[PDB]
């Protein structure tokens, strides 16, 4: 999600 994407 926007500002919660731990992949990159």
Resolution (A): 1.2
Token couple for 5: 């994407």
CB atoms within 10 A of CB 4: 5
Q: What tokens were used for 1?
A: 């999600």
The one-character DSSP state at 1 is -
Q: Using CA atoms, how far apart are residues 3 and 5, in angstroms rounded to an integer? A: 6
């Amino acid at each position: 999600y926007i500002q919660n994407c731990p992949l990159g």
